[PDB]
Design brief:
The structure is cut from a larger assembly and holds 2 copies of chain A.
Chain A lengths: L24 H6 L19
Chain lengths: 49, 49
């Protein structure tokens, strides 16, 4: 019906925090996936930029 | 709830709930069956009475 595309840049270690229902700094105080999230997490490196 | 972060603790509490919630139906079903015996014995009394 209606999608929300939201993006940001995080570290290569903390991206495993980027799982809904997990802990760690990015999911604790920065950006929070919900308790029931069906969204897809797309992640890649942009080290050359 | 104290030890574990909720996202995993959800699955744990299931095994409690599923266990306990089942354990009620066991108890309830027993009472139904057992009451149906008393219900039969009650009529025997009401018949004698």
């Amino acid at each position: 019906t209606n999608v929300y595309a939201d993006s940001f840049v995080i570290r290569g270690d903390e991206v495993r925090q980027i799982a809904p229902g997990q802990t760690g700094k990015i999911a604790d105080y920065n950006y929070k996936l919900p308790d029931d999230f069906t969204g897809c997490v797309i992640a890649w490196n942009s080290n050359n930029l | 709830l104290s030890r574990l972060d909720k996202v995993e603790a959800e699955v744990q509490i299931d095994r409690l709930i599923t266990g306990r919630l089942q354990s009620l139906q066991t108890y309830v079903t027993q009472q139904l069956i057992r009451a149906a015996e008393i219900r039969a014995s009650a009529n025997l009394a009401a018949t004698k009475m």
